[PDB]
Structure 1
Amino acid sequence: SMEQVAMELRLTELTRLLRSVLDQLQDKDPARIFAQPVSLKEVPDYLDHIKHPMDFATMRKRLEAQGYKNLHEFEEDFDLIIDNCMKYNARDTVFYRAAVRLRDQGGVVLRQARREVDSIG
């Protein structure tokens, strides 16, 4: 149906916007602390601590399968990246501090992305 097609064109345009949002968010992580999943080989206890791991590569895989239906879903995953890190790592660490910075800087990007997703529909 043409209705189905038009919904698919909306999903695709959301996907394009979310890709640019994701690149912008990831530039706020020049150290690449959040680039890849935490390794269970190097933090073998990780999953006793953190129930839903997230990272930018996993977000990117989901994005390219057009797996985000809206901005809310994408933001939930970005938030898990931050929130996971701030629980596992202590306040005095380079990891926790990189999370705080990503959060603060990412908040600006997401503020306007929310207006672009509303605005362009």
Structure 2
Amino acid sequence: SMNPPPPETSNPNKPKRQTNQLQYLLRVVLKTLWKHQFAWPFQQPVDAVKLNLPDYYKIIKTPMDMGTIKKRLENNYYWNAQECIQDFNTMFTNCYIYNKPGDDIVLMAEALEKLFLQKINELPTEE
């Protein structure tokens, strides 16, 4: 029940790097999913307290949300686009695990994972 501490967004000793693709993940991919009608549930960590889901963090062990993605991008916390894409994947996977097919939150996710996959089909090249 009690809310764990969010995932970190800055880490002095982690190798950081700004690539063209990482720039794209924030400027085009993150910031177009953000505006979607179904983004809001995923714009910050899940508050198992506010929602009264004391079991969320007992089932979800790697939490992830577009809020901590947007914070990680803007902090250039990532080394390459793939680790940022992995955090999106974890976010969706989390939602399909704690929930079951047909739930409204899954519908929002399944959709967002569709929009996400369509937007990252074509990433920029490196200089």
- TM bucket (normalised to shorter chain) is 0.7 to 0.9
Structure with greater helix share of residues: 1
| Among 36, 39, 44, the residue aligned to 1:36 | 44
Q: What residue number does 1:56 align with?
A: 66
CA distance in 2, matches of 1:31, 1:24: 10
RMSD over aligned CA atoms reads 2.0
Q: Is the contact between residue 35 and residue 57 of structure 1 (CA under 8 Å) also seen in structure 2?
A: yes
| Among 11, 31, 34, the residue aligned to 2:18 | 11
CA distance in 2, matches of 1:27, 1:58: 16
How far has the Cα of 1:15 moved from its partner? 4.5
Structure 2 vs 1, CA of residues 77 and 29 (structure 1 numbering), >3 Å: closer, same or farther? farther
CA distance in 2, matches of 1:78, 1:57: 11
Structure 2 vs 1, CA of residues 104 and 14 (structure 1 numbering), >3 Å: closer, same or farther? closer
Q: Which amino acid aligns with 2:105?
A: F
State the TM-score, normalizing by the size of structure 1.
0.78
CA distance in 2, matches of 1:28, 1:112: 20
Tell me the secondary structure at the aligned position of residue 73 of structure 2.
helix
How far has the Cα of 1:120 moved from its partner? 2.9
5 Å-filtered alignment, 1:87-102, equals 87-102=97-112
5 Å-filtered alignment, 1:18-33, equals 18-20=25-27, 21-33=29-41
Q: What are the Cα deviations for residues 75-110 of structure 1, in whole angstroms up to 9, with x where unaligned?
A: 000011111101111112100111111111111101
Q: Which amino acid aligns with 2:88?
A: F
User: How many residue pairs align between the two structures?
Assistant: 109
Q: What are the Cα deviations for residues 42-79 of structure 1, in whole angstroms up to 9, with x where unaligned?
A: 32221210110111111111112110111100100001
Q: What residue number does 2:117 align with?
A: 107
Q: Which amino acid aligns with 2:82?
A: H
